[PDB]
């Protein structure tokens, strides 16, 4: 078992509609806690979970530091879109997308179990940091342009230092500062509804984390409720497994 600190960047070009757009979000487990969007006027990193409204108390420079980082990252990936377009011999007329996901999985006791830094171009793997955090794997021939650059520049060492150090440390800080949000295990509110045509529908509402097992069929994808939790339904007994349930529940109409 573990917890994770995970960041997601999307940069995409919009030829004819100004500069590329850059959006960054951060999560701890299934809770989003920070965002940045380059299309805002004077864009800043902004809190999106309750404990981040307090981080300024113990870390008064948090928002300036991460706003500066994100503004710089937006400018870098603007040029990155041009570079990668060139590696693929693509025209300037089309819109293209770079995505990045990076972060750390941390088990009990605070030890790094896995660090990662993966990039995609136009929805497909482009380059990734190897599990040893010391070298890179290009997913195709065009991406070897980036792999050669990053190998010679020594960027794996900088990623390694973040993933083994800062990432783990920040995950632990957020877990404790955000305990009431992150360390909760809220069980689903469960009930069966009845619609003759007869459809039985087993509901699971308001649960956290997202992982759940619903069994009786039509099983909808788990969906956010908009308040920081999740919903699912399946449509005789219905059985529900969730981390927040001491034992698997059984329901019938």
């Amino acid at each position: 078992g573990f917890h994770s600190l995970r960041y997601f960047y999307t940069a995409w070009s919009r030829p004819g509609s100004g500069e590329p757009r850059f959006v960054a979000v951060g999560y701890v487990d299934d809770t989003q806690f920070v965002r940045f969007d380059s299309d805002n006027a004077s864009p800043r990193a902004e809190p999106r979970a309750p404990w981040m409204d307090l981080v300024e108390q113990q870390d008064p420079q948090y928002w300036d530091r991460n706003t500066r980082n994100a503004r710089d990252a937006a400018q870098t990936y603007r040029v990155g879109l041009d570079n990668v377009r060139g590696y693929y011999n693509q025209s300037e007329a089309g819109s293209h997308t770079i995505q990045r996901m990076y972060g750390c999985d941390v088990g009990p006791h605070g030890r790094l179990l896995r660090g990662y830094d993966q990039l995609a171009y136009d929805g497909a793997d482009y380059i990734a940091l190897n599990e040893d955090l010391r070298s890179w794997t290009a997913a195709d021939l065009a991406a070897q342009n980036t792999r050669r650059k990053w190998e010679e520049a020594g960027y794996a060492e900088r990623d390694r230092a973040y993933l083994e150090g800062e990432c783990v440390e920040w995950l632990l800080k957020h877990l404790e500062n955000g305990r009431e949000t992150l360390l909760r295990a809220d069980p689903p509110k469960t009930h069966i509804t009845h619609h003759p045509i007869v459809t039985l529908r087993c509901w699971a509402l308001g649960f956290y984390p997202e992982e759940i097992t619903l069994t009786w069929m039509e099983l909808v994808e788990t969906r956010p409720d908009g308040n920081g939790a999740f919903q699912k339904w399946a449509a005789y007994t219905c059985h529900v497994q969730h981390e927040g349930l001491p034992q698997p529940l059984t329901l019938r109409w």
């Binding site: 870098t76 990936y77 990045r100 990053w150 960027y155 990623d159």
Partner: peptide, 8 residues
């Protein structure tokens, strides 16, 4: 904090 960003 966000990590470093590297130019592709």
């Amino acid at each position: 904090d966000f990590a470093n960003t590297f130019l592709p």
